[PDB]
Short mmCIF file of N, CA and C and ligand atoms in Angstrom, two decimals:
data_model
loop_
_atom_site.label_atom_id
_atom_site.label_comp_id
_atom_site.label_asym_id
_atom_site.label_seq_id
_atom_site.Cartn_x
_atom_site.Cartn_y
_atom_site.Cartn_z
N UNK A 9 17.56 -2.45 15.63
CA UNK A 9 16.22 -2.92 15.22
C UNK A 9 15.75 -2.19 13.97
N UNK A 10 15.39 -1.13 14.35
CA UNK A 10 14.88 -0.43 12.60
C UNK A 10 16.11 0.11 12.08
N UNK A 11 16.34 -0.21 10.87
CA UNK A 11 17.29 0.01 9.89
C UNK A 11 17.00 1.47 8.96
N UNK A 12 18.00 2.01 9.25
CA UNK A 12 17.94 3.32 7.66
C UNK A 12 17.29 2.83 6.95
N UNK A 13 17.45 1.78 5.74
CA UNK A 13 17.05 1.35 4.88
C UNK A 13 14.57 1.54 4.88
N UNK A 14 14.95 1.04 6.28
CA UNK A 14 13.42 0.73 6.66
C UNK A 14 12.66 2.15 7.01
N UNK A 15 13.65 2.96 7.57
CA UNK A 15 13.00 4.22 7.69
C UNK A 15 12.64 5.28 6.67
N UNK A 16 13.79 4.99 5.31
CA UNK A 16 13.55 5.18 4.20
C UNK A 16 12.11 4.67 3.31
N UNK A 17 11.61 3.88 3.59
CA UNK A 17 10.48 3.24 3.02
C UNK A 17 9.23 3.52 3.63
N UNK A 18 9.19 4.14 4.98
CA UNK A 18 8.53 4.49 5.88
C UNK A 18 7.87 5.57 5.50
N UNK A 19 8.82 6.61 5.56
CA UNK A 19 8.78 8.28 5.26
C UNK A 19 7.83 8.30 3.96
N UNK A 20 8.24 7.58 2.57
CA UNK A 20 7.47 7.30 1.40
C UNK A 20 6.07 7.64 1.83
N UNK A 21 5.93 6.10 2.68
CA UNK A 21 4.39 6.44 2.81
C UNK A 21 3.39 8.06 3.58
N UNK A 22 4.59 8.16 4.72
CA UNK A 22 3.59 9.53 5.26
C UNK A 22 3.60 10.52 4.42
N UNK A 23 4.77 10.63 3.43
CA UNK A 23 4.73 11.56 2.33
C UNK A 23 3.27 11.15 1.49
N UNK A 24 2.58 10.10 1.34
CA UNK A 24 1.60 10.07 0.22
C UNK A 24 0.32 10.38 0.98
N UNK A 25 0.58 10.16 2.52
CA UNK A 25 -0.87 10.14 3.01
C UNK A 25 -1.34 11.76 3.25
N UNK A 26 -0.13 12.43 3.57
CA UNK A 26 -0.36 14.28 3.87
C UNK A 26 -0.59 14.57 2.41
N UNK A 27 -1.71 15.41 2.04
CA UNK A 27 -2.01 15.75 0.98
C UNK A 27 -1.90 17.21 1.19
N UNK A 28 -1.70 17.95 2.15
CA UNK A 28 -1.19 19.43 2.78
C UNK A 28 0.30 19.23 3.00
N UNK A 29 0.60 18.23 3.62
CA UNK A 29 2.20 18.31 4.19
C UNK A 29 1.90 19.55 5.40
N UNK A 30 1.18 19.21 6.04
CA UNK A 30 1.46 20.04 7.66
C UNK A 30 2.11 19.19 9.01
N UNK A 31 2.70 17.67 8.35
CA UNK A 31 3.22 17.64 9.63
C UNK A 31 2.50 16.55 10.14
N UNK A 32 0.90 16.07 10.20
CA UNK A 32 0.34 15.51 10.99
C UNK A 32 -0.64 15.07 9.77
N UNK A 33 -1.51 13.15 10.20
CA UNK A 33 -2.59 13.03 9.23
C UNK A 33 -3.84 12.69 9.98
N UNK A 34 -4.94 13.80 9.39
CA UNK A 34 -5.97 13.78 9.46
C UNK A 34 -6.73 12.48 9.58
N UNK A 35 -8.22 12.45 10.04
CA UNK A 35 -8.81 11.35 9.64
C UNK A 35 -9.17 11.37 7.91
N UNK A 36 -9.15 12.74 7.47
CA UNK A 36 -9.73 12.70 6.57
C UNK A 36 -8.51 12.55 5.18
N UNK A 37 -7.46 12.47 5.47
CA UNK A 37 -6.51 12.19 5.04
C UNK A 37 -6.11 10.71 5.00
N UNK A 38 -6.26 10.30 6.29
CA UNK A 38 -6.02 8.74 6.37
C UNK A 38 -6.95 7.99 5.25
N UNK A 39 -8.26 8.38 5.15
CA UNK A 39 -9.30 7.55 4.56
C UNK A 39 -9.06 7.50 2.85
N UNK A 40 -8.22 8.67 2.48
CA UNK A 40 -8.28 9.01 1.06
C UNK A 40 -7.53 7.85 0.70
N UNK A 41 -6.38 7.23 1.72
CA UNK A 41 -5.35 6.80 0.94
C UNK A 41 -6.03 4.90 1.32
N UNK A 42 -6.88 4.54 2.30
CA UNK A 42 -7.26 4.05 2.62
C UNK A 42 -8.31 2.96 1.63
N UNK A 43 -9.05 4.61 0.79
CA UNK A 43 -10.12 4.14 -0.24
C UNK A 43 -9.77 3.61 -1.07
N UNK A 44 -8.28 3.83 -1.84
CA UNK A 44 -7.84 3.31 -2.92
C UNK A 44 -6.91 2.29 -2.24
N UNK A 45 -7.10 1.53 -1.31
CA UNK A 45 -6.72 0.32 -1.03
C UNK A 45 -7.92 -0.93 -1.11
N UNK A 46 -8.63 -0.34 -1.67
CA UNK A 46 -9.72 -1.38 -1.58
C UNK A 46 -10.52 -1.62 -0.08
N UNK A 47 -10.45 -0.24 0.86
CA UNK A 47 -10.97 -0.54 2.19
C UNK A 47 -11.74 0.42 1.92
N UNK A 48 -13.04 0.07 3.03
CA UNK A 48 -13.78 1.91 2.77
C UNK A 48 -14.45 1.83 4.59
N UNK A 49 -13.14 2.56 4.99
CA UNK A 49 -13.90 2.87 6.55
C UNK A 49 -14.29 4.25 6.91
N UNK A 50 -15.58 4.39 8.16
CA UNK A 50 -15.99 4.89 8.36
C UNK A 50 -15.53 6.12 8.91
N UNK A 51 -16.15 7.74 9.59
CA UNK A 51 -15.16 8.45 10.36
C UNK A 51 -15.14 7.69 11.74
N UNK A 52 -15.93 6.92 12.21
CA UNK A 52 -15.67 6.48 13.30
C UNK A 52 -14.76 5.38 13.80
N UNK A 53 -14.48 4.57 12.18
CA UNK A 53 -13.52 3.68 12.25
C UNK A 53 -12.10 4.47 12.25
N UNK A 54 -11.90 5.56 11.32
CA UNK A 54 -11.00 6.37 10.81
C UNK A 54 -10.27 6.52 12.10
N UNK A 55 -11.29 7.36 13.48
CA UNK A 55 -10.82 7.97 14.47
C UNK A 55 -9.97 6.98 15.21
N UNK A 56 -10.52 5.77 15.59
CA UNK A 56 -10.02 4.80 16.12
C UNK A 56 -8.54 4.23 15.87
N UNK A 57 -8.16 4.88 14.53
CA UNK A 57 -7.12 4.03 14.01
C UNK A 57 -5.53 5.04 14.31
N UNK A 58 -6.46 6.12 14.37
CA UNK A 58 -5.50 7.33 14.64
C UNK A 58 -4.69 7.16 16.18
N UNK A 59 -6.23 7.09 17.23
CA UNK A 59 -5.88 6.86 18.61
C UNK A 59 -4.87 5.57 19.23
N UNK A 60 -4.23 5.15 18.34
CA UNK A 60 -3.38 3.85 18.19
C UNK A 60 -2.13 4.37 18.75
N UNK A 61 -1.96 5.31 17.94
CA UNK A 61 -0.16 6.06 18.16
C UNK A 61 -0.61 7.81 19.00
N UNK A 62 -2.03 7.99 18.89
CA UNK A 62 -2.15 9.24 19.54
C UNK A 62 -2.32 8.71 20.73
N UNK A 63 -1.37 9.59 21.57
CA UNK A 63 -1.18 10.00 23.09
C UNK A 63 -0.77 11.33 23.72
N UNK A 64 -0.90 12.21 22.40
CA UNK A 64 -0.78 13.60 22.57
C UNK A 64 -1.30 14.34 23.18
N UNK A 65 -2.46 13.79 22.72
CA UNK A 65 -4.04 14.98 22.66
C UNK A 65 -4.33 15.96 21.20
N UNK A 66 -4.07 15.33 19.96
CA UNK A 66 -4.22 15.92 19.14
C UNK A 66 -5.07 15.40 18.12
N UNK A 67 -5.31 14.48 17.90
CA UNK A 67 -6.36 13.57 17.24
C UNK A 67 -5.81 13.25 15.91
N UNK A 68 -4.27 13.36 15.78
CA UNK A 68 -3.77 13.54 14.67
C UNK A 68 -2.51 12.49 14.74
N UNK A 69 -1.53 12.05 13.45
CA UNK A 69 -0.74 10.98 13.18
C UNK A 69 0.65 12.19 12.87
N UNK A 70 1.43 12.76 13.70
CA UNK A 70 2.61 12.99 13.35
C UNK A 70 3.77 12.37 12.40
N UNK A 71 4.79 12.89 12.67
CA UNK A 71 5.58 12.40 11.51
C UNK A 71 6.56 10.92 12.72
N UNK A 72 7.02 11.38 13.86
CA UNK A 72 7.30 10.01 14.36
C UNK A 72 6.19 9.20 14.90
N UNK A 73 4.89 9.57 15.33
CA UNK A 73 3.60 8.86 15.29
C UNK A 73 4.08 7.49 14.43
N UNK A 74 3.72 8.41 13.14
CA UNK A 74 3.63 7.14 12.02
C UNK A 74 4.79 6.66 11.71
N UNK A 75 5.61 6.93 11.63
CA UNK A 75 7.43 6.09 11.98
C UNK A 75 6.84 4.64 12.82
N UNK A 76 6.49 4.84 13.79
CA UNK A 76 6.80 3.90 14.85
C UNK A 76 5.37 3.04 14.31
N UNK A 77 4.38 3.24 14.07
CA UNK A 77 3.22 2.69 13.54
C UNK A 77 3.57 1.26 12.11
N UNK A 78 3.91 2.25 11.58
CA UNK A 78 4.74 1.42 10.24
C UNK A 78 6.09 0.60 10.45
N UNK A 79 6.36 1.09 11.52
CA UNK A 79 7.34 -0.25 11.73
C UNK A 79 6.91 -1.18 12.40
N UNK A 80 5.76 -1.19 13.12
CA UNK A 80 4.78 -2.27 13.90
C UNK A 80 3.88 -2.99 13.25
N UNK A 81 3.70 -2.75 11.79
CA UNK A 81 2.69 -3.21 10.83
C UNK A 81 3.03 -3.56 9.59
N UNK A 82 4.13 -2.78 9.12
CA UNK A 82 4.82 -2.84 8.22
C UNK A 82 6.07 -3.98 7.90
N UNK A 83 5.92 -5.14 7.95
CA UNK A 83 6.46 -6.45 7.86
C UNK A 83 7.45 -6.86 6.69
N UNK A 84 7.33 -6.01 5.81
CA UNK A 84 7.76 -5.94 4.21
C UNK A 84 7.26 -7.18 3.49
N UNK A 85 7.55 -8.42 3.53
CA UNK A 85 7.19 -9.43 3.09
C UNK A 85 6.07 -10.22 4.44
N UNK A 86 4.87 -10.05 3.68
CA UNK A 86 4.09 -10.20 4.71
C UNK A 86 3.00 -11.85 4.73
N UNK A 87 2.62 -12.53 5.37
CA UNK A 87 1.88 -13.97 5.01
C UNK A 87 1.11 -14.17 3.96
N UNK A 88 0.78 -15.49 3.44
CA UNK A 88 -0.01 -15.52 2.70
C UNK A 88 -1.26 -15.59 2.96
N UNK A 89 -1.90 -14.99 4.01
CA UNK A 89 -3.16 -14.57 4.18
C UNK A 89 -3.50 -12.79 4.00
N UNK A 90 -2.31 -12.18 4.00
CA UNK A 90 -2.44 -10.62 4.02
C UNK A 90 -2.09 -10.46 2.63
N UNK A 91 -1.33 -11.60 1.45
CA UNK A 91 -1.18 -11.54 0.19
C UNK A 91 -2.30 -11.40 -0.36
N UNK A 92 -3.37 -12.22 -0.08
CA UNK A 92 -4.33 -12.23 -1.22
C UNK A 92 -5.49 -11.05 -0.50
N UNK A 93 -5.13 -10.23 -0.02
CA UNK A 93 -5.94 -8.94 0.93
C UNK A 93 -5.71 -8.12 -0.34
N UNK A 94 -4.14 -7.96 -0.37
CA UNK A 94 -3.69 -7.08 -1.04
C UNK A 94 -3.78 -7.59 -2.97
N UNK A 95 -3.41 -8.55 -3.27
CA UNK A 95 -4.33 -9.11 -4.84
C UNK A 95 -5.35 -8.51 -5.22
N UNK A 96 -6.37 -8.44 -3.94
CA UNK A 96 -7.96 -7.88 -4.50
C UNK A 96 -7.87 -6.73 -5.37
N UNK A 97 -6.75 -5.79 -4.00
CA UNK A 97 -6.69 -4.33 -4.65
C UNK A 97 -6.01 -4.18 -6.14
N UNK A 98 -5.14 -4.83 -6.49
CA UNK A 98 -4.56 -4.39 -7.74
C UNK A 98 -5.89 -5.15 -8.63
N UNK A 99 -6.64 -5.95 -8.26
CA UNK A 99 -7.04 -7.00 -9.29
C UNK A 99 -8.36 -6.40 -9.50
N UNK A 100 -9.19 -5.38 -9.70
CA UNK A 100 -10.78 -4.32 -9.43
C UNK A 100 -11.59 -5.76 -10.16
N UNK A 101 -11.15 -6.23 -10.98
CA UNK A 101 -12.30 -6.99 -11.68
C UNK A 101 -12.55 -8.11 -11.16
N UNK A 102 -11.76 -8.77 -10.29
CA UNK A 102 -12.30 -10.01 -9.52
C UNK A 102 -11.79 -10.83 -10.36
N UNK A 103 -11.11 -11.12 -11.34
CA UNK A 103 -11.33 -12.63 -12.47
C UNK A 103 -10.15 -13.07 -12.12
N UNK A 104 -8.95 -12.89 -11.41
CA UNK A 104 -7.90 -13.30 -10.65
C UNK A 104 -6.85 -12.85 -11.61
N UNK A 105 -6.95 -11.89 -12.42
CA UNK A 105 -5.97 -11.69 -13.63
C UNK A 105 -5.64 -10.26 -13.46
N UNK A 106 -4.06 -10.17 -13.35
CA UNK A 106 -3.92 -8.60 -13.16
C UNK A 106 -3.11 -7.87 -14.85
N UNK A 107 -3.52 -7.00 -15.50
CA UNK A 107 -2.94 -6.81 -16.83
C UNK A 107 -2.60 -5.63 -15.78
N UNK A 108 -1.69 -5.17 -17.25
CA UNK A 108 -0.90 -3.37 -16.73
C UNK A 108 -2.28 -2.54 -17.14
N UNK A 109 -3.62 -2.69 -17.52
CA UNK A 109 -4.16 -1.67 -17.55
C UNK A 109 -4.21 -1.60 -16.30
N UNK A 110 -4.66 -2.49 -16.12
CA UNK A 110 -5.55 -2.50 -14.04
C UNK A 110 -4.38 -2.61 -13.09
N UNK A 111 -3.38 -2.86 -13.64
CA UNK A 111 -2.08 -2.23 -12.91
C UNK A 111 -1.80 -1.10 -12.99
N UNK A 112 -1.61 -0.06 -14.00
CA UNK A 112 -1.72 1.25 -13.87
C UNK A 112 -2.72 2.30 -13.09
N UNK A 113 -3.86 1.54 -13.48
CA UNK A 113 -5.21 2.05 -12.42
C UNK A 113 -5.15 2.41 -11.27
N UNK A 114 -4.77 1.09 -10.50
CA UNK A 114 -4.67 1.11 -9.04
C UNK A 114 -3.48 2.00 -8.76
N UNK A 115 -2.71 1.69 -9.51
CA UNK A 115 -1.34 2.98 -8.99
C UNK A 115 -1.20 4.69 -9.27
N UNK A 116 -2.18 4.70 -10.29
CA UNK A 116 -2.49 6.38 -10.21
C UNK A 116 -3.27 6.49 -9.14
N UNK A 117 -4.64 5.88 -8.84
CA UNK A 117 -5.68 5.74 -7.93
C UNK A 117 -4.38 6.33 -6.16
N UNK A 118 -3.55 5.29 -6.47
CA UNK A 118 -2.76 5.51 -5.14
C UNK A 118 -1.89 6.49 -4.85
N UNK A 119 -1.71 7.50 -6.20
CA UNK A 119 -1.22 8.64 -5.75
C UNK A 119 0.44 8.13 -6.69
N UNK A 120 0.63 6.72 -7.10
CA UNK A 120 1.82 7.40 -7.83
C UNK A 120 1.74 7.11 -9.23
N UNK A 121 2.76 8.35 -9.69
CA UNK A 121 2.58 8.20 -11.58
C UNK A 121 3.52 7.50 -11.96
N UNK A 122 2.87 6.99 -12.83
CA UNK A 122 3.90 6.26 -13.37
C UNK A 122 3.60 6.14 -15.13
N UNK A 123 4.26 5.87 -16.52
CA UNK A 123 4.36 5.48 -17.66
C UNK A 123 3.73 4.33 -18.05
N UNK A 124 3.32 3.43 -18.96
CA UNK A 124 2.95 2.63 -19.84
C UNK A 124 4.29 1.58 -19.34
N UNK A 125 5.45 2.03 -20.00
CA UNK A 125 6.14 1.01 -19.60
C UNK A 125 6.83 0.14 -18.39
N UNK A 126 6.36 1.51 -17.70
CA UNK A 126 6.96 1.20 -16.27
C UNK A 126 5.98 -0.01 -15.19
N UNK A 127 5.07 -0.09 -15.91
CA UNK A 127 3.72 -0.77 -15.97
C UNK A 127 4.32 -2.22 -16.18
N UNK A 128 4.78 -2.20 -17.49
CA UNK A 128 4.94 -3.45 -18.28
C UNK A 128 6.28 -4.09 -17.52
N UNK A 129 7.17 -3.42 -16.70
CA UNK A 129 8.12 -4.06 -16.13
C UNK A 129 7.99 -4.70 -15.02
N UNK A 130 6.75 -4.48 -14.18
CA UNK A 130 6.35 -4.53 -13.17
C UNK A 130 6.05 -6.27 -13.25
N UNK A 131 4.86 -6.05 -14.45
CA UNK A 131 4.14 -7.36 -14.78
C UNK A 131 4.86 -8.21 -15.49
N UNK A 132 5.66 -7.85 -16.28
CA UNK A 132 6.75 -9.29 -16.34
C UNK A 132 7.85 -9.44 -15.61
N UNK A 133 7.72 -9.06 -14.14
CA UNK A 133 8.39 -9.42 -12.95
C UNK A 133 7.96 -10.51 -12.46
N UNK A 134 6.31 -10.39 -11.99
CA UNK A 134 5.83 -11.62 -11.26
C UNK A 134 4.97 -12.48 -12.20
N UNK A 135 5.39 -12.02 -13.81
CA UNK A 135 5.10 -12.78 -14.88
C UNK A 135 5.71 -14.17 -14.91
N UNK A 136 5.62 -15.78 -15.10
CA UNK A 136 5.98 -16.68 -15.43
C UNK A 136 5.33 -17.31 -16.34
N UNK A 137 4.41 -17.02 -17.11
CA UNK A 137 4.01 -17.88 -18.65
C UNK A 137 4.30 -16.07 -19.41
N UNK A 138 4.25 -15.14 -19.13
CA UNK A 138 4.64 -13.93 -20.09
C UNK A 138 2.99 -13.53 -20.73
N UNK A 139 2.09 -13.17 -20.33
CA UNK A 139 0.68 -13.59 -21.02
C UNK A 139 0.40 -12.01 -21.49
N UNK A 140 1.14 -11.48 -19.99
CA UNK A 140 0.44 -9.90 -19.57
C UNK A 140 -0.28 -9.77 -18.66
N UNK A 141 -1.10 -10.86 -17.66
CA UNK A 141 -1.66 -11.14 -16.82
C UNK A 141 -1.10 -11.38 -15.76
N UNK A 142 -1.08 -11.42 -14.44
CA UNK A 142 -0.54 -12.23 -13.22
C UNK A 142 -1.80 -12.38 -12.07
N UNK A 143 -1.55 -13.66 -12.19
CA UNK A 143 -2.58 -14.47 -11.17
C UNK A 143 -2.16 -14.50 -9.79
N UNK A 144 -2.83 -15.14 -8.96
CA UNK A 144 -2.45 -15.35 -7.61
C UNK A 144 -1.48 -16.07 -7.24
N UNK A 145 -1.11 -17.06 -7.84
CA UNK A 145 0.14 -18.07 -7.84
C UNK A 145 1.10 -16.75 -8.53
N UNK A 146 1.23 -16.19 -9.23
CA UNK A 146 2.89 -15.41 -9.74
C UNK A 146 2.42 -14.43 -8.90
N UNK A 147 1.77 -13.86 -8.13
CA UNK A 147 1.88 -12.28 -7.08
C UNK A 147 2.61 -12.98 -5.73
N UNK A 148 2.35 -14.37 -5.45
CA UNK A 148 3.52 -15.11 -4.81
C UNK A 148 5.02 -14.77 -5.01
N UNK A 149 4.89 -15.45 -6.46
CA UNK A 149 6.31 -15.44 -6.73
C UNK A 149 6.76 -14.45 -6.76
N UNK A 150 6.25 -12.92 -6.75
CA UNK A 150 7.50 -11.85 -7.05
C UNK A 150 7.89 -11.65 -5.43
N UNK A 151 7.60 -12.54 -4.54
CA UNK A 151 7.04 -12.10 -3.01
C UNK A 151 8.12 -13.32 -2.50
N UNK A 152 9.22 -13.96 -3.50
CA UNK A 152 9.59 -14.91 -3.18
C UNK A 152 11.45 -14.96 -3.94
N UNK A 153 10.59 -14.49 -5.19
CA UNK A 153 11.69 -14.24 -6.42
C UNK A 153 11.79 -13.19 -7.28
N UNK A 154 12.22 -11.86 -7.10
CA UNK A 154 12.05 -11.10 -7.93
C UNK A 154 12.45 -11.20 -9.28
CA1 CA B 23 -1.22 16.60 6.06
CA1 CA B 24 -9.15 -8.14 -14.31
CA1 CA B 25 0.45 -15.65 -16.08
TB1 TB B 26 -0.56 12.99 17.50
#
Protein backbone atom coordinates (compact mmCIF):
# COMPACT_ATOMS: atom_id res chain seq x y z
CA UNK A 1 0.00 0.00 0.00
CA UNK A 2 2.28 2.98 0.83
CA UNK A 3 5.17 3.07 -1.42
CA UNK A 4 8.90 4.41 -0.62
CA UNK A 5 8.37 6.73 -3.22
CA UNK A 6 5.17 8.15 -1.12
CA UNK A 7 6.90 8.13 2.11
CA UNK A 8 9.53 10.16 0.57
CA UNK A 9 7.11 13.00 -0.18
CA UNK A 10 5.58 12.66 3.15
CA UNK A 11 8.66 13.27 5.37
CA UNK A 12 9.12 16.72 3.03
CA UNK A 13 6.21 17.95 4.51
CA UNK A 14 6.79 17.22 8.43
CA UNK A 15 10.21 18.54 7.72
CA UNK A 16 8.52 22.11 6.78
CA UNK A 17 5.92 22.07 9.45
CA UNK A 18 8.68 21.54 12.65
CA UNK A 19 10.21 24.83 12.74
CA UNK A 20 12.36 23.40 16.02
CA UNK A 21 12.71 19.84 14.61
CA UNK A 22 11.86 18.24 18.12
CA UNK A 23 10.17 15.39 16.80
CA UNK A 24 6.50 16.38 17.28
CA UNK A 25 4.05 19.47 15.76
CA UNK A 26 2.68 21.88 17.84
CA UNK A 27 -0.62 23.61 17.42
CA UNK A 28 1.31 26.47 17.01
CA UNK A 29 3.39 25.07 14.42
CA UNK A 30 0.60 23.47 12.53
CA UNK A 31 -1.10 26.98 12.04
CA UNK A 32 2.13 28.72 10.65
CA UNK A 33 2.19 26.41 7.79
CA UNK A 34 -1.55 26.42 7.60
CA UNK A 35 -1.63 30.45 7.24
CA UNK A 36 0.28 30.48 4.18
CA UNK A 37 -2.12 28.09 2.66
CA UNK A 38 -4.64 30.49 2.41
CA UNK A 39 -6.52 28.98 5.67
CA UNK A 40 -6.57 30.91 8.92
CA UNK A 41 -7.77 28.56 11.79
CA UNK A 42 -8.33 29.10 15.13
CA UNK A 43 -6.36 27.51 18.44
CA UNK A 44 -9.41 25.73 18.93
CA UNK A 45 -9.73 24.56 15.45
CA UNK A 46 -5.82 23.93 15.47
CA UNK A 47 -6.36 21.52 18.62
CA UNK A 48 -8.94 19.50 16.98
CA UNK A 49 -6.94 18.70 14.02
CA UNK A 50 -4.06 17.42 16.03
CA UNK A 51 -6.50 14.99 18.12
CA UNK A 52 -7.08 13.13 14.71
CA UNK A 53 -3.81 11.00 14.89
CA UNK A 54 -3.29 11.87 18.76
CA UNK A 55 -3.95 8.86 20.92
CA UNK A 56 -0.97 9.28 23.00
CA UNK A 57 -1.77 11.76 25.39
CA UNK A 58 0.47 14.33 24.12
CA UNK A 59 -1.40 16.94 22.28
CA UNK A 60 1.18 16.75 19.71
CA UNK A 61 1.71 15.26 15.78
CA UNK A 62 4.81 12.88 15.89
CA UNK A 63 6.85 11.86 13.18
CA UNK A 64 4.73 8.45 12.40
CA UNK A 65 1.52 10.43 13.66
CA UNK A 66 1.90 12.43 10.57
CA UNK A 67 3.19 9.54 8.21
CA UNK A 68 -0.05 7.87 8.56
CA UNK A 69 -2.16 11.26 8.47
CA UNK A 70 -0.67 12.22 5.05
CA UNK A 71 -1.17 9.14 3.62
CA UNK A 72 -4.97 9.37 4.51
CA UNK A 73 -5.28 12.87 2.97
CA UNK A 74 -2.64 13.08 0.85
CA UNK A 75 -4.13 11.75 -2.60
CA UNK A 76 -1.34 13.29 -4.85
CA UNK A 77 -3.55 14.10 -7.72
CA UNK A 78 -6.50 15.22 -6.04
CA UNK A 79 -10.45 16.26 -7.61
CA UNK A 80 -11.44 19.05 -9.23
CA UNK A 81 -13.15 20.48 -6.39
CA UNK A 82 -9.93 20.46 -4.00
CA UNK A 83 -8.06 21.99 -7.35
CA UNK A 84 -9.55 25.18 -7.32
CA UNK A 85 -9.13 25.26 -3.10
CA UNK A 86 -5.69 25.11 -3.84
CA UNK A 87 -5.63 27.92 -7.17
CA UNK A 88 -6.86 30.49 -4.59
CA UNK A 89 -3.63 30.02 -2.70
CA UNK A 90 -1.07 30.51 -5.39
CA UNK A 91 -3.46 33.11 -7.08
CA UNK A 92 -3.51 36.22 -3.69
CA UNK A 93 -5.10 38.58 -6.23
CA UNK A 94 -8.25 36.83 -7.14
CA UNK A 95 -8.16 37.82 -11.07
CA UNK A 96 -7.68 34.01 -11.95
CA UNK A 97 -4.10 34.75 -13.31
CA UNK A 98 -1.08 33.23 -11.72
CA UNK A 99 2.45 35.15 -12.95
CA UNK A 100 5.89 33.92 -11.32
CA UNK A 101 5.74 37.05 -9.22
CA UNK A 102 2.75 35.63 -7.23
CA UNK A 103 4.23 32.36 -7.85
CA UNK A 104 7.32 33.09 -6.08
CA UNK A 105 5.34 34.77 -3.23
CA UNK A 106 3.34 32.02 -2.20
CA UNK A 107 6.40 29.72 -2.24
CA UNK A 108 8.75 31.72 -0.05
CA UNK A 109 5.52 32.48 2.13
CA UNK A 110 5.58 28.44 2.34
CA UNK A 111 8.87 28.03 3.55
CA UNK A 112 10.61 27.06 0.22
CA UNK A 113 13.37 29.09 -1.67
CA UNK A 114 13.57 29.12 -4.62
CA UNK A 115 15.32 31.57 -7.81
CA UNK A 116 13.62 33.78 -10.47
CA UNK A 117 14.06 31.11 -12.82
CA UNK A 118 13.04 28.28 -11.13
CA UNK A 119 9.80 30.27 -11.00
CA UNK A 120 9.67 30.65 -14.71
CA UNK A 121 9.90 26.81 -15.26
CA UNK A 122 7.22 26.08 -13.16
CA UNK A 123 4.84 28.50 -15.15
CA UNK A 124 5.62 27.43 -18.49
CA UNK A 125 4.78 23.94 -17.35
CA UNK A 126 1.07 24.48 -16.87
CA UNK A 127 1.60 27.32 -19.44
CA UNK A 128 -0.40 26.64 -22.88
CA UNK A 129 -0.74 30.13 -24.74
CA UNK A 130 3.04 31.02 -23.03
CA UNK A 131 1.63 34.60 -21.65
CA UNK A 132 3.39 34.17 -18.12
CA UNK A 133 0.09 33.76 -16.55
CA UNK A 134 -1.80 30.42 -15.74
CA UNK A 135 -5.43 30.32 -15.30
CA UNK A 136 -7.68 27.76 -13.95
CA UNK A 137 -8.10 25.73 -17.10
CA UNK A 138 -3.87 25.24 -17.44
CA UNK A 139 -3.49 24.53 -13.29
CA UNK A 140 -5.69 21.51 -14.70
CA UNK A 141 -3.52 20.71 -17.20
CA UNK A 142 -0.22 20.40 -15.34
CA UNK A 143 -2.57 18.02 -13.02
CA UNK A 144 -3.10 15.97 -16.17
CA UNK A 145 0.03 16.66 -18.42
CA UNK A 146 3.13 17.72 -17.22
CA1 LIG B 1 8.80 20.94 15.90
CA1 LIG C 1 -2.98 37.91 -9.86
CA1 LIG D 1 -2.30 31.25 -20.21
TB1 LIG E 1 1.15 12.44 19.59
Amino acid sequence: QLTEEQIAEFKEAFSLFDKDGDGTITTKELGTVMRSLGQNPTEAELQDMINEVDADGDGTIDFPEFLTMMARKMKDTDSEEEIREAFRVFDKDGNGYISAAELRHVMTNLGEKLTDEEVDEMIREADIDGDGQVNYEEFVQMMTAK
